[PDB]
């Protein structure tokens, strides 16, 4: 390579240890402003900001190709712009006109396929062990899923875009009564503005019959302005849009919760302060109330960090490698080759030649990587347990003494990774204090190796004299030196670990409660080492050691004199045992006046949450939180696996060598002076909020699927009829205790409810009662004996749910005085958990979710793994240029988790899950939210009222088969049943071959009578339905389809799938559905029916000579096709006043209504003194809404400017209290 010079690597050398002082920072002139250096980046990149909002429901409208003209249609210049791209688009001619999902939102980037009228994900939800060409039906199912989560997500947030101002005497007098003042250049269309414009009089006539009601106001353009209470701008304008009510509603939960949250960007300086040193000021720049921005949400942190810890065990070497690169910016502990381990003239003595073999064995050097380390791990989070460095000692020389003193130092600077290793430190104790006092060594050993702490309060000691292992740091077992209990006889072991106490104070996190930040606890306390010593003579800290080596220099004095070693040998020992008084004076200076101001701002940041010590070795443990589940394992946080971060685990004791002895410090040289670096705020800010920003968008398709879902889980019950004339469903419901013990009982210990009540068979109804009105779920426990005939009255009403040990005679355990209870009369059925259990936020029990749940096919665990990952692949997170860098280091697996009903509860250390306390753990860990923010349970309730729509849910169910004539065709008209048919229900017992006349045919018999009909042509008439179509044979399904035709025949098939187009007539049908595939198919295949509105048909001619054929038509709908149907036929007929069957449009379609205070969408009163009707509570589609935006004064969510200035002296900051 280069290597140079060694002339100029010698001089190398001379340069690195003799360093010097520059950089005066003086200029120094006037500036009358504000003397701006940093900016600031937003604390969430939450919302975009387009300026057109598109909605979730548009217009669409299918032309027939006579009557139509296919020109623009031209009005005046100042009414194109408004009326304009409505009039050409209910141009005369318009024969259907349907409401669907927008394409241009839901778009191809998404995977939704909206081209065959519902929504269709590929591979999302795909039936497992069915043929290979039935996983189309699924995809409605799957489809609904990326709407639900397309809104769910939808974080937009609208700006005023290129708005107008008309004149208004440029606009007629009937579009100046409804124009606000002002409209966007995008006006949508709304059949609203067709009133005196459109050609068609009937329709001109239901418009202006509707608008002239009291009901509804049509209105376009300003309604609301918010003048700010300052400035005197307007912020907050609403625009009365052409929008469909899902997407206004959505847009304004955005800014209802932007404007009325009332933290401005000036609260920015809040989460400076906690990344800087303390007592640092931030000036100006006083922006106020005209820069809003969302409060950084202190639940959803602190809820994905909790599955970030669990998912991914190597988080902890990312908080740490944050924390290292704030130890390593500070240039506070630099290292220097110039060792000082002994004084002068003892290394070449030769009576210490014994100890200088046992101070430099165990000094390492000063590598720079590891000190700037040993500090990060100590406010960092632990998640994985840290284990000791292995050392070797035999304890044989009073010169051994040395191993002890690493332990001393290592208990003072580092007294949170002490804690952490506290046991395996007494693995090697228990060999010094054997070996040196074997007299009080078992007396010690008698009491205990370990001890645990009982409810009570008190030390149950153990009494097995057992090496400790870094498991059980874990369990309830503590080391036993550590309890600061005296024992009578062992007053010298008890002695000497009072000398491993800390001394230091307990911080609350001050500035990290203000910034609003993701912590842990309750109250987050840290664990800081050293008090700041401003203004002491004698250092209060270095005394401390002062007292330590007094009180080992009696130790290694007696052990040396019980072996009549040398005076030399002794005496060489006390001087070194003072040079390391000499030593620690010069560097406790600066470790209470420098350190101690870094280690109380590294306790502020927001991804060191946890609480690290407390300042009792005796009591203290690590607060043991587990991501549990009931259809799983819990998986604990801290959680020892050995899973490195490339020596992380590994704490090294012989670092506190280099740090007493040869690392200078920049206040132990005063003669300079160094000019204290302040760390800038930037730097470890955008590190924790990149992180903070990748982990709470990473388990986003784990959340949605396990939302859905969450009900999912299933009992097995048994229903007992007690009386006569019931259905499959009353009776006393009763199912297993193993049933119970899986899956009701865990999901009670999560509600937070108490047990429920053993009834013994003399339980009255007000107890049972007693446990329904307390445990929510209705499920009693049986205990034994009989229950009363009284009680069984009280079971049977309210279904509450029996749970027996086992099914062994069950009508004995009942009092049955009506005798019709018996052990074979039951229905084995299922029961859903989210049946019987309610919560705000644990289940959800809604009923839109109810409904796809029964659309799902049979899942499993493996189905669940699949539609994660396949939503991960269409939304492709934000990811920053930091945030690359963490994905790529956890950094892939996230599946050996089940995320069912997952919550998050403590533990005991024996291994049982707690239940919810009030008192200890946080308010963030009650009900974990699906893991999901506090936006998207809002705007998923507006998503849950967009997929029960009725007008969007045309996935159709149902086929009817009859051979009627097509003369009047229309998508409306099921065809009615005749009057004397007889209801058949299929199966495969009623056709059979049999020999008829000189040939085999298929033999149909007719259940009612048992006459066997060969022949297709002589069957009576039979309305035939089909519930199964599996397993049956294609010369069946022949005859079938044949005796449609011959014997007039009509066959149901309910368990089939399709779509359906409404054709116009000048298209005509484009492609046909064989009957060959309506009858041999697989169950999941969803088929394309073309039905066509022949409504505007051309009339022909009286004069025409006739045709020969007829138009027949072989399959029809069981069900309403059309429902997205708003307008049908816009002509206008020559004869008659209004065309037959063709529809105006429903009034709420044109009802803006005002705008709630909350932010809720509301309808025209229909009279004075009447709140109007909102819009989520109806199933009324409105396409004119209006929308809180933001104007040109806002800019929500830039960089905003301030000033940092440094402190003083970094003496001269105040730690505690504050």
């Known amino acids: 390579k280069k290597p140079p010079t060694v002339v100029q690597s010698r001089t190398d050398v001379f340069n690195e240890q003799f360093a010097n002082e520059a950089l005066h920072p003086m200029t120094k002139v006037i500036f009358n402003g504000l003397d701006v250096n940093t900016e600031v980046q937003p604390l969430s990149d939450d919302f975009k900001q387009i300026s057109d909002p598109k909605g979730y429901l548009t217009y669409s409208v299918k032309y027939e190709d006579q009557f139509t003209k296919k020109d623009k249609l031209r009005a005046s210049e100042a009414d194109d712009r408004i009326v304009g791209p409505?009039?050409?688009?209910?141009?005369?001619?318009?024969?259907?006109?349907?409401?669907?999902?927008?394409?241009?939102?839901?778009?191809?980037?998404?995977?939704?396929?909206?081209?065959?009228?519902?929504?269709?994900?590929?591979?999302?939800?795909?039936?497992?062990?069915?043929?290979?060409?039935?996983?189309?039906?699924?995809e409605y199912v799957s489809g609904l899923l990326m709407v639900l989560f397309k809104v769910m997500t939808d974080n937009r947030l609208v700006i005023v875009g290129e708005t107008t101002t008309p004149m208004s005497n440029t606009l007629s007098t009937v579009v100046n009564n409804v124009l606000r003042t002002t409209y966007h250049n995008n006006v949508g269309v709304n059949p609203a503005l067709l009133r005196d414009f459109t050609q068609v009089n009937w329709l001109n006539r239901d418009i202006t019959n509707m608008?002239?009601?009291?009901?509804?106001?049509?209105?376009?353009?300003?309604?609301?302005?918010?003048?700010?209470?300052?400035?005197?701008?307007?912020?907050?304008?609403?625009?009365?849009?052409?929008?469909?009510?899902?997407?206004?509603?959505?847009?304004?939960?955005?800014?209802?919760?932007?404007?009325?949250a009332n933290v401005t960007a000036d609260d920015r300086i809040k989460a400076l302060q906690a990344h800087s040193m303390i007592s640092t000021q931030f000036h100006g720049p006083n922006q106020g109330?005209?820069?809003?921005?969302?409060?950084?949400?202190?639940?959803?942190?602190?809820?994905?960090?909790?599955?970030?810890?669990?998912?991914?065990?190597?988080?902890?070497?990312?908080?740490?490698?944050?924390?290292?690169?704030?130890?390593?910016?500070?240039?506070?502990?630099?290292?220097?080759?110039?060792?000082?381990?002994?004084?002068?003239?003892?290394?070449?003595?030769?009576?210490?030649?014994?100890?200088?073999?046992?101070?430099?064995?165990?000094?390492?050097?000063?590598?720079?990587?590891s000190i700037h380390l040993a500090i990060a791990r100590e406010v960092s989070p632990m998640f994985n347990v840290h284990e000791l460095k292995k050392i070797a000692e035999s304890f044989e020389d009073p010169s051994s003494i040395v191993v002890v003193l690493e332990f001393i130092l290592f208990a003072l600077f580092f007294p949170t990774e002490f804690n952490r290793i506290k046991g395996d430190i007494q693995n090697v104790l228990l060999l010094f204090f054997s070996r040196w006092y074997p007299v009080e060594y078992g007396i010690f050993i008698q009491r205990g190796a370990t001890y645990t702490i009982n409810a009570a309060g008190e030390f149950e000691f153990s009494g097995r004299n057992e090496k400790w292992d870094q498991s059980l740091y874990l369990s309830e077992h503590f080391p036993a030196l550590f309890s600061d209990v005296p024992l009578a006889g062992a007053n010298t072991i008890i002695a000497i670990m009072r000398l491993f106490t800390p001394q230091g104070f307990?911080?609350?996190?001050?500035?990290?409660?203000?910034?609003?930040?993701?912590?842990?606890?309750?109250?987050?306390?840290?664990?800081?080492?050293?008090?700041?010593?401003?203004?002491?003579?004698?250092?209060?800290?270095?005394?401390?050691?002062?007292?330590?080596?007094?009180?080992?220099?009696?130790?290694?004095?007696?052990?040396?004199?019980?072996?009549?070693m040398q005076k030399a040998t002794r005496s060489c020992t006390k001087q070194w045992l003072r040079h390391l008084e000499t030593q620690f004076d010069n560097i406790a200076v600066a470790h209470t006046d420098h350190l101690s101001v870094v280690y109380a701002t590294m306790s502020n940041f927001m991804l060191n949450f946890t609480n690290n010590f407390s300042g009792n070795h005796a009591t203290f443990k690590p607060d043991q939180y587990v991501i549990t589940s009931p259809e799983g394992s819990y998986k604990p946080i801290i959680e020892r696996q050995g899973e490195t971060v490339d020596g992380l685990t590994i704490i090294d004791t012989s670092i506190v060598w280099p740090i007493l002895c040869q690392c200078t410090y920049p206040l132990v040289r005063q003669s300079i002076m160094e000019e204290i670096v302040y760390p800038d705020p930037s730097t470890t800010l955008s590190q924790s909020l990149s992180v903070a920003q990748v982990l709470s968008k990473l388990t986003?398709?784990?959340?949605?699927?396990?939302?859905?879902?969450?009900?999912?889980?299933?009992?097995?019950?048994?229903?007992?009829?007690?009386?006569?004339?019931?259905?499959?469903?009353?009776?006393?419901?009763?199912?297993?205790?193993?049933?119970?013990?899986?899956?009701?009982?865990?999901?009670?210990?999560?509600?937070?409810?108490?047990?429920?009540?053993?009834?013994?068979?003399?339980?009255?109804?007000?107890?049972?009662?007693?446990?329904?009105?307390?445990?929510?779920?209705?499920?009693?426990?049986?205990?034994?004996?009989?229950?009363?005939?009284?009680?069984?009255?009280?079971?049977?009403?309210?279904?509450?749910?029996?749970?027996?040990?086992?099914?062994?005679?069950?009508?004995?355990r009942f009092a049955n005085a009506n005798l019709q209870m018996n052990n074979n009369r039951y229905h084995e059925s299922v029961l859903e958990i989210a049946d019987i259990f309610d919560q705000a936020d644990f289940i959800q029990t809604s009923d839109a979710v109810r409904q796809?749940?029964?659309?799902?096919?049979?899942?499993?665990?493996?189905?669940?793994?699949?539609?994660?990952?396949?939503?991960?692949?269409?939304?492709?997170?934000?990811?920053?240029?930091?945030?690359?860098?963490?994905?790529?280091?956890?950094?892939?697996?996230?599946?050996?988790?089940?995320?069912?009903?997952?919550?998050?509860?403590?533990?005991?250390?024996?291994?049982?899950?707690?239940?919810?306390?009030?008192?200890?753990?946080?308010?963030?860990?009650?009900?974990?939210?699906?893991?999901?923010?506090?936006?998207?349970?809002?705007?998923?309730?507006?998503?849950?009222r967009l997929i029960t729509n009725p007008r969007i849910a045309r996935r159709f169910d149902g086929v009817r088969i009859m051979y009627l004539t097509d003369d009047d065709p229309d998508p409306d008209f099921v065809p009615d049943v005749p009057e004397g048919y007889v209801a058949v229900q299929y199966a495969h017992r009623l056709f059979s071959s049999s020999l008829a006349n000189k040939r085999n045919r298929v033999t149909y018999t007719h259940p009612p009578t048992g006459m066997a009909y060969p022949s297709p042509t002589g069957r009576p008439h039979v309305h035939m339905t089909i519930n199964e179509r599996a397993g049956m044979s294609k010369l069946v399904a022949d005859n079938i389809i044949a005796s449609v035709i011959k014997s007039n025949w009509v066959v149901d098939i309910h368990d089939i799938e399709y779509t359906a187009e409404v054709m116009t007539p000048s298209e005509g049908y484009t492609q046909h559905v064989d009957a060959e595939s309506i009858m041999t198919a697989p169950k999941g295949k969803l088929f394309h029916l073309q039905f066509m509105d022949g409504l505007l048909r051309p009339e022909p001619s009286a004069f025409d000579p006739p045709a020969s054929g007829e138009d027949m038509r072989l399959i029809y709908p069981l069900q309403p096709i059309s429902v997205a149907r708003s307008m049908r036929a816009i002509v206008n007929h020559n004869e008659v006043d209004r065309p037959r069957?063709?529809?105006?449009?429903?009034?709420?379609?044109?009802?803006?209504?005002?705008?709630?205070?909350?932010?809720?969408?509301?309808?025209?009163?229909?009279?004075?003194?009447?709140?109007?009707?909102?819009?989520?509570?109806?199933?009324?589609?409105?396409?004119?809404?209006?929308v809180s935006m933001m104007t040109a004064n806002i800019r929500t969510g830039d960089d905003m400017a301030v000033e940092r200035v440094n402190p003083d002296d970094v003496r001269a900051i105040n730690i505690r209290n504050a």
């Not at 398709?701 to 007690?722: E, H, K, W």
């Open 506 to 564: 307990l911080r609350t996190d001050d500035l990290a409660i203000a910034a609003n930040f993701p912590r842990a606890s309750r109250n987050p306390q840290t664990y800081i080492p050293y008090t700041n010593q401003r203004g002491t003579v004698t250092n209060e800290f270095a005394s401390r050691f002062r007292t330590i080596v007094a009180t080992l220099a009696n130790v290694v004095n007696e052990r040396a004199v019980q072996d009549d």
């Open 852 to 944: 796809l749940r029964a659309l799902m096919p049979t899942l499993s665990t493996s189905q669940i793994r699949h539609a994660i990952e396949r939503i991960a692949q269409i939304t492709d997170v934000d990811s920053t240029d930091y945030g690359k860098l963490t994905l790529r280091f956890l950094g892939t697996l996230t599946r050996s988790l089940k995320m069912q009903n997952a919550q998050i509860r403590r533990i005991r250390p024996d291994g049982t899950v707690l239940r919810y306390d009030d008192q200890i753990d946080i308010e963030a860990f009650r009900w974990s939210r699906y893991f999901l923010d506090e936006l998207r349970l809002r705007r998923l309730s507006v998503g849950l």
């Open 289 to 369: 109330a005209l820069r809003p921005e969302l409060a950084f949400d202190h639940d959803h942190i602190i809820r994905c960090l909790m599955l970030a810890a669990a998912n991914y065990p190597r988080l902890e070497g990312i908080i740490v490698q944050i924390n290292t690169g704030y130890v390593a910016s500070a240039n506070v502990i630099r290292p220097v080759s110039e060792k000082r381990y002994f004084p002068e003239n003892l290394e070449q003595n030769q009576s210490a030649a014994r100890l200088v073999s046992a101070v430099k064995a165990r000094a390492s050097e000063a590598d720079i990587s």
């Open 700 to 812: 986003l398709p784990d959340a949605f699927i396990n939302m859905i879902l969450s009900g999912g889980d299933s009992v097995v019950m048994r229903t007992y009829q007690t009386e006569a004339d019931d259905d499959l469903d009353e009776g006393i419901r009763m199912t297993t205790y193993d049933q119970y013990l899986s899956h009701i009982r865990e999901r009670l210990h999560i509600t937070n409810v108490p047990d429920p009540i053993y009834i013994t068979g003399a339980s009255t109804p007000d107890q049972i009662a007693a446990s329904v009105q307390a445990t929510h779920v209705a499920v009693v426990l049986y205990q034994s004996g009989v229950i009363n005939g009284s009680a069984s009255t009280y079971l049977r009403e309210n279904e509450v749910l029996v749970v027996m040990p086992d099914y062994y005679d069950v009508v004995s």
């Open 1141 to 1186: 069957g063709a529809v105006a449009p429903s009034s709420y379609e044109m009802d803006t209504g005002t705008l709630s205070r909350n932010g809720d969408l509301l309808y025209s009163p229909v009279a004075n003194g009447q709140v109007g009707i909102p819009k989520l509570e109806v199933d009324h589609i409105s396409f004119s809404n209006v």
């Open 86 to 138: 409505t009039v050409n688009l209910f141009k005369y001619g318009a024969a259907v006109v349907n409401i669907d999902l927008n394409r241009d939102f839901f778009d191809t980037a998404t995977g939704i396929d909206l081209t065959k009228g519902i929504p269709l994900v590929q591979d999302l939800l795909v039936p497992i062990g069915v043929t290979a060409g039935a996983e189309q039906s699924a």
């Open 211 to 260: 608008l002239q009601q009291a009901g509804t106001k049509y209105g376009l353009g300003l309604t609301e302005t918010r003048l700010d209470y300052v400035r005197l701008v307007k912020t907050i304008v609403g625009h009365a849009l052409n929008i469909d009510h899902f997407a206004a509603s959505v847009l304004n939960i955005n800014l209802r919760a932007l404007m009325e």
